[PDB]
PDB file of C-alpha atoms in Angstrom:
ATOM      1  CA  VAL G  12      -7.180  72.965 -27.629  1.00 28.00           C
ATOM      2  CA  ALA G  13      -5.255  77.937 -28.463  1.00 28.97           C
ATOM      3  CA  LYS G  14      -5.137  75.550 -31.375  1.00 26.70           C
ATOM      4  CA  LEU G  15      -6.900  73.593 -33.917  1.00 22.47           C
ATOM      5  CA  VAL G  16      -5.855  69.998 -33.323  1.00 20.93           C
ATOM      6  CA  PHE G  17      -6.842  67.022 -35.807  1.00 18.44           C
ATOM      7  CA  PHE G  18      -7.181  64.011 -33.387  1.00 18.17           C
ATOM      8  CA  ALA G  19      -6.719  60.712 -35.707  1.00 19.54           C
ATOM      9  CA  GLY G  20      -6.343  56.812 -35.094  1.00 20.91           C
ATOM     10  CA  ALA G  21     -11.217  56.140 -39.167  1.00 19.06           C
ATOM     11  CA  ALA G  22     -12.230  59.758 -39.223  1.00 20.63           C
ATOM     12  CA  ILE G  23     -10.120  63.000 -38.397  1.00 20.29           C
ATOM     13  CA  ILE G  24     -11.599  64.559 -35.335  1.00 20.98           C
ATOM     14  CA  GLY G  25     -10.692  68.619 -35.253  1.00 21.08           C
ATOM     15  CA  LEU G  26     -11.169  70.289 -31.825  1.00 21.20           C
ATOM     16  CA  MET G  27     -10.063  73.539 -30.531  1.00 21.55           C
TER      17      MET G  27
ATOM     18  CA  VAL N   5     -14.577  61.916 -50.265  1.00 17.24           C
ATOM     19  CA  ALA N   6     -10.613  62.397 -53.810  1.00 15.95           C
ATOM     20  CA  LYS N   7      -9.848  64.635 -50.928  1.00 17.12           C
ATOM     21  CA  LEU N   8      -9.984  64.954 -47.172  1.00 16.30           C
ATOM     22  CA  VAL N   9     -13.098  66.779 -46.405  1.00 16.73           C
ATOM     23  CA  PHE N  10     -13.794  68.801 -43.300  1.00 14.99           C
ATOM     24  CA  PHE N  11     -17.237  68.706 -42.179  1.00 13.46           C
ATOM     25  CA  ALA N  12     -18.356  71.346 -39.578  1.00 13.42           C
ATOM     26  CA  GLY N  13     -21.600  72.164 -37.942  1.00 10.26           C
ATOM     27  CA  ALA N  14     -18.797  71.335 -32.212  1.00  6.67           C
ATOM     28  CA  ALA N  15     -16.213  69.160 -33.494  1.00  7.81           C
ATOM     29  CA  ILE N  16     -14.898  69.278 -37.133  1.00  4.75           C
ATOM     30  CA  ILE N  17     -15.140  65.638 -38.774  1.00  2.00           C
ATOM     31  CA  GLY N  18     -12.413  64.936 -41.451  1.00  2.00           C
ATOM     32  CA  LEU N  19     -13.168  62.384 -43.930  1.00  2.00           C
ATOM     33  CA  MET N  20     -11.940  61.370 -47.544  1.00  2.00           C
TER      34      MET N  20
ATOM     35  CA  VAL P  12       1.757  60.743 -35.925  1.00  2.00           C
ATOM     36  CA  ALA P  13      -1.938  59.982 -32.251  1.00  2.00           C
ATOM     37  CA  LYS P  14      -2.687  63.382 -34.712  1.00  2.00           C
ATOM     38  CA  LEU P  15      -2.866  64.263 -38.377  1.00  2.00           C
ATOM     39  CA  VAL P  16       0.551  66.540 -38.753  1.00  2.00           C
ATOM     40  CA  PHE P  17       0.605  68.874 -41.495  1.00  2.00           C
ATOM     41  CA  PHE P  18       4.302  68.923 -42.250  1.00  2.00           C
ATOM     42  CA  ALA P  19       5.346  71.918 -44.682  1.00  2.00           C
ATOM     43  CA  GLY P  20       8.601  73.592 -45.931  1.00  2.00           C
ATOM     44  CA  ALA P  21       5.992  73.709 -51.747  1.00  2.00           C
ATOM     45  CA  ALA P  22       3.054  71.182 -50.758  1.00  2.00           C
ATOM     46  CA  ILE P  23       1.748  70.314 -47.408  1.00  2.00           C
ATOM     47  CA  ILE P  24       2.220  66.664 -46.726  1.00  2.00           C
ATOM     48  CA  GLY P  25      -0.427  65.725 -43.845  1.00  2.00           C
ATOM     49  CA  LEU P  26       0.556  62.480 -41.906  1.00  2.00           C
ATOM     50  CA  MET P  27      -0.638  60.734 -38.980  1.00  2.00           C
TER      51      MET P  27
ATOM     52  CA  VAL Z  29      -6.043  75.675 -55.982  1.00  2.00           C
ATOM     53  CA  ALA Z  30      -8.098  80.234 -54.202  1.00  2.00           C
ATOM     54  CA  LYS Z  31      -8.257  77.673 -51.585  1.00  2.00           C
ATOM     55  CA  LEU Z  32      -5.871  74.976 -49.797  1.00  2.00           C
ATOM     56  CA  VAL Z  33      -7.182  71.827 -51.153  1.00  2.00           C
ATOM     57  CA  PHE Z  34      -6.280  68.337 -49.105  1.00  2.00           C
ATOM     58  CA  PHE Z  35      -5.780  65.965 -51.941  1.00  2.00           C
ATOM     59  CA  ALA Z  36      -6.428  62.104 -50.642  1.00  2.00           C
ATOM     60  CA  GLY Z  37      -6.054  58.808 -51.613  1.00  2.00           C
ATOM     61  CA  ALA Z  38      -1.354  57.448 -47.752  1.00  2.00           C
ATOM     62  CA  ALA Z  39      -0.232  61.093 -47.032  1.00  2.00           C
ATOM     63  CA  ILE Z  40      -2.395  64.068 -47.846  1.00  2.00           C
ATOM     64  CA  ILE Z  41      -1.219  66.777 -49.945  1.00  2.00           C
ATOM     65  CA  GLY Z  42      -2.374  70.257 -49.502  1.00  2.00           C
ATOM     66  CA  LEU Z  43      -2.190  72.620 -52.500  1.00  2.00           C
ATOM     67  CA  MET Z  44      -3.585  76.119 -53.236  1.00  2.00           C
TER      68      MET Z  44
ATOM     69  CA  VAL K   3       5.876  77.359 -37.956  1.00  2.00           C
ATOM     70  CA  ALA K   4       8.381  73.378 -39.661  1.00  2.00           C
ATOM     71  CA  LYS K   5       4.547  72.770 -39.990  1.00  2.00           C
ATOM     72  CA  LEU K   6       1.149  74.033 -40.950  1.00  2.00           C
ATOM     73  CA  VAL K   7       0.027  75.361 -37.258  1.00  2.00           C
ATOM     74  CA  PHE K   8      -4.131  75.971 -37.201  1.00  2.00           C
ATOM     75  CA  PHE K   9      -4.144  78.896 -34.483  1.00  2.00           C
ATOM     76  CA  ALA K  10      -8.015  79.234 -33.194  1.00  2.00           C
ATOM     77  CA  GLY K  11      -9.461  81.552 -30.644  1.00  2.00           C
ATOM     78  CA  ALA K  12     -13.821  83.077 -34.997  1.00  2.00           C
ATOM     79  CA  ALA K  13     -11.388  82.419 -38.206  1.00  2.00           C
ATOM     80  CA  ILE K  14      -8.649  79.621 -37.839  1.00  2.00           C
ATOM     81  CA  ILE K  15      -5.316  80.816 -38.999  1.00  2.00           C
ATOM     82  CA  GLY K  16      -3.157  78.598 -40.957  1.00  2.00           C
ATOM     83  CA  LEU K  17       0.562  79.633 -40.492  1.00  2.00           C
ATOM     84  CA  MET K  18       4.118  78.012 -41.211  1.00  2.00           C
TER      85      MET K  18
ATOM     86  CA  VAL S   9     -19.232  77.656 -45.095  1.00  2.00           C
ATOM     87  CA  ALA S  10     -21.616  73.002 -44.037  1.00  2.00           C
ATOM     88  CA  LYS S  11     -17.692  72.409 -44.222  1.00  2.00           C
ATOM     89  CA  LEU S  12     -14.405  74.028 -42.727  1.00  2.00           C
ATOM     90  CA  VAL S  13     -13.289  75.911 -45.912  1.00  2.00           C
ATOM     91  CA  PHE S  14      -9.483  76.727 -45.770  1.00  2.00           C
ATOM     92  CA  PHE S  15      -9.292  80.147 -47.941  1.00  2.00           C
ATOM     93  CA  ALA S  16      -5.904  80.753 -49.292  1.00  2.00           C
ATOM     94  CA  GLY S  17      -4.330  83.440 -51.533  1.00  2.00           C
ATOM     95  CA  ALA S  18      -0.039  84.807 -46.653  1.00  2.00           C
ATOM     96  CA  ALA S  19      -2.082  83.238 -43.791  1.00  2.00           C
ATOM     97  CA  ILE S  20      -4.619  80.526 -44.747  1.00  2.00           C
ATOM     98  CA  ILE S  21      -8.271  81.549 -43.096  1.00  2.00           C
ATOM     99  CA  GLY S  22     -10.369  78.724 -42.172  1.00  2.00           C
ATOM    100  CA  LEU S  23     -14.088  79.509 -42.061  1.00  2.00           C
ATOM    101  CA  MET S  24     -17.338  77.686 -41.759  1.00  2.00           C
TER     102      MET S  24
END
């Protein structure tokens, strides 16, 4: 998103 | 998987 | 915290 | 531990 | 940066 | 490296 963002809320989803 | 494993190969998928 | 947040400041503490 | 290792199994604990 | 921040944009660079 | 590997040993360097 820059940074690597770890979305949570289950697998963690890392996206730039 | 314990540890948090970041699968890659695209979003990164973090799973225990 | 959502996202996985890596608190630092020593071990890193990852919390949602 | 080198690498940053994310221990899981609850907070994740990142240690070298 | 506190937290461990993963700078992206290539290697990811993790800095406090 | 697949997985996202956080090399340490200073900035952390995340590489696939």
